[PDB]
């Protein structure tokens, strides 16, 4: 066990190993309660997040467990990973705080489309890395669900990582129509819809579907992709949804070349394959990586899948102290990653 030290920051108590020095709050609450720090073990900048009230209820306790499990699992260049997890408690009885250490990333993509007017080459590379990280998450049967520009972080070298900072830019604007309305018939390709919205915004500098609510959101969507045909109506089990959709005045699918005018036609084509209404026909991450738009970057020998992830906990109903103990176990069993770089 290392030696900890204590300080107070922006109305919060922080007790951390001496290893971590020069804590400095970042993002004014936008990221959580998170400090930039200096890691004396590596000489690298890192980010340290202290979870807020991790075991206050059964639901917080379970979220805490889930976040820890997911973070310990992710080992891929384009997915956030865990450098360290610690608590100052010496025993389960004392266990009340969880700190998570990750790389400190440079900026989000909201703060890069909001700034730059992105080049086609930069778009290729950024979307390539999203898709590469998604192939990996998807292969472990993990669905992101909340993909949007503020959940993507990039460095000065344009190396990208997928993350989720949790609860300016609304989730609904990137959310797949099938998990907007009903929530039964969806797959991993809800994330691909989101990548299509993101890519469009990087190309044009404009939120593709900036709806004010779920109804307005759907309307903006149908204007581009057209109202569902009879083949897709057949697969809608929600009576109210089906009534709603068929109640609307029918709209043609737009030709995306007439919308994304002047874009690389390989970009346009890929967008037609991502932004399809029927989730059974939407391109997967794995398929999209092989799309000719990523010719400069695709390497089918360097797009790894994940080890399987034991998600069985998600269907369990346990007490706070049980979720707590399980999280304690995962803290104790943590093996830090290899440092060499
Ligand atoms: C919404 C639920 C909870 C809250 N989510 C999770 O469970 C996931 C892990 C799960 C995983 C994430 C990616 C794939 C999908 C699932 N959890 C994290 O992703 C997660 C966990 C911990 C952190 C800690 N790091 C930072 O805060 C950080 C890093 N870079 N910067 C930085 C700084 C300036 C400019 C730009 C960036 C930060 N502020 C960061 C993300």
Q: Is 52 annotated as a binding residue?
A: no
**Structural method:** X-ray
Angle between helices 58-73 and 320-332 (to 10 degrees): 20
Kindly state if the Cβ of 337 falls inside 6 Å of ligand 1: no
Q: Which CATH number fits domain 109-294: 1.10.10.60, 3.30.950.10, 1.10.510.10, 3.40.50.150?
A: 1.10.510.10
Specify the residue with its C-alpha closest to ligand 1, atom 32: 105
Beta-ladder partners of 153: 108, 161
How many residues make up the chain in this entry?
341
Kindly state if the Cβ of 201 falls inside 6 Å of ligand 1: no
- Identify which of 46, 60, 80, 109 to mutate to test ligand 1's pocket (most ligand atoms within 8 A of the CB): 80
CA-nearest of 104, 100, 113, 109 to 129 is 109
Resolution in angstrom units? 2.0
Q: Is 101 annotated as a binding residue?
A: no
| Residue 245 Cα to ligand 1 middle (Å) | 36
Which DSSP state fits 126? H
Choose the catalytic residue: 120, 164, 269, 278: 164
| Residue 49 Cα to ligand 1 middle (Å) | 9
**Using an 8 Å Cβ cutoff, are 258 and 233 in contact?**
no
Q: Is 166 annotated as a binding residue?
A: no
| Residue 79 Cα to ligand 1 middle (Å) | 10
Kindly state if the Cβ of 191 falls inside 6 Å of ligand 1: no
The strand pair at 44-50 and 34-39 is best described as antiparallel
Kindly state if the Cβ of 29 falls inside 6 Å of ligand 1: no
**Using an 8 Å Cβ cutoff, are 289 and 132 in contact?**
yes
| Residue 47 Cα to ligand 1 middle (Å) | 10
**Using an 8 Å Cβ cutoff, are 33 and 48 in contact?**
no
Query: Residue holding tokens 């730059």?
Result: 116
- Measured from the CA of 104, which atom of ligand 1 is nearest? 30
CB crowding 156-180: b at 16 or more within 10 Å, else e = eeeebbbbebeeebeebbbbbbbbb
Rounded distance between C-alpha atoms, residue 123 and residue 119, angstroms: 6
Task: For residue 299, give Cα distances in angstroms to 282, 289, 294, 296, 303.
Answer: 22, 9, 9, 9, 7
Kindly state if the Cβ of 163 falls inside 6 Å of ligand 1: yes
Long-range residue pairs from 315-319, CB within 8 A, at least 24 positions apart, any chain: 318/58, 318/62, 319/58
Output the DSSP codes for 237-249: --HHHHHHHHHSP
Specify the residue with its C-alpha closest to ligand 1, atom 14: 163
CA-nearest of 263, 265, 305, 259 to 284 is 305
Kindly state if the Cβ of 31 falls inside 6 Å of ligand 1: yes
164 is catalytic: yes
The percent of the chain in helix, strand and coil, each rounded to the nearest 5, is 40, 15, 45
Rounded distance between C-alpha atoms, residue 64 and residue 99, angstroms: 11
**Residue 39, helix vs strand vs coil:** strand
Task: Kindly state the tokens that stand for 36.
Answer: 């930039």
| Residue 148 Cα to ligand 1 middle (Å) | 13
**Residue 56, helix vs strand vs coil:** coil
Tell how far CA 14 is from the center of its chain: 27
- Nearest 10 degrees: CA dihedral of 98, 102, 333, 144? 90
- Contacting residues for 17 by C-beta, under 8 A, at least 6 apart: 2, 3, 4, 5, 86
The strand pair at 84-86 and 160-162 is best described as unpaired
Kindly state if the Cβ of 160 falls inside 6 Å of ligand 1: no
């Amino acid at each position: 066990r290392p030696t900890f030290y204590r300080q107070e920051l922006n109305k919060t108590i922080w007790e951390v190993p001496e290893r971590y020095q020069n804590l400095s709050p970042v993002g004014s609450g936008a990221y959580g309660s998170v400090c930039a720090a200096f890691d004396t073990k590596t000489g690298h900048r890192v980010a340290v997040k202290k979870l807020s009230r991790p075991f206050q209820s059964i639901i917080h306790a379970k979220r805490t467990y889930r976040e820890l499990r997911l973070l310990k699992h992710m080992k891929h260049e384009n997915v956030i990973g865990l450098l360290d997890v610690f608590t100052p408690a010496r025993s389960l009885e004392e266990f009340n705080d969880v700190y998570l250490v990750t790389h400190l990333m440079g900026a989000d993509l909201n703060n890069i489309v909001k700034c730059q007017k992105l080049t086609d080459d930069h778009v290729q590379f950024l979307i390539y890395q999203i898709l590469r990280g998604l192939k990996y998450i998807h292969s472990a049967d993990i669905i992101h669900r909340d993909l949007k520009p503020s959940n993507l972080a990039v460095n000065e070298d344009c190396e990208l990582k997928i993350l989720d900072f949790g609860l300016y830019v609304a989730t609904r604007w990137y959310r797949a129509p099938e998990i907007m309305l009903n929530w039964m018939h969806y797959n991993q390709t809800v994330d691909i819809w989101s990548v299509g919205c993101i890519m469009a915004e990087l190309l044009t500098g404009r939120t593709l579907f900036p709806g004010t609510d779920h109804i307005d959101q759907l309307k903006l969507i149908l204007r581009l992709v057209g109202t569902p045909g009879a083949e897709l109506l057949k697969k809608i089990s929600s009576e109210s949804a089906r009534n709603y959709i068929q109640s609307l005045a029918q709209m043609p699918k737009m030709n995306f070349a007439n919308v994304f005018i002047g874009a690389n036609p390989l970009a346009v084509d890929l967008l037609e394959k991502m932004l399809v209404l029927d989730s059974d026909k939407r391109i997967t991450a794995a398929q999209a990586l092989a799309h000719a738009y990523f010719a400069q970057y695709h390497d089918p020998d360097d797009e790894p899948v994940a080890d399987p992830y034991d998600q069985s906990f998600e269907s369990r109903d346990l007490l706070i102290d049980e979720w707590k103990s399980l999280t304690y176990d995962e803290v104790i069993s943590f093996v830090p990653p290899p440092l060499d770089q």
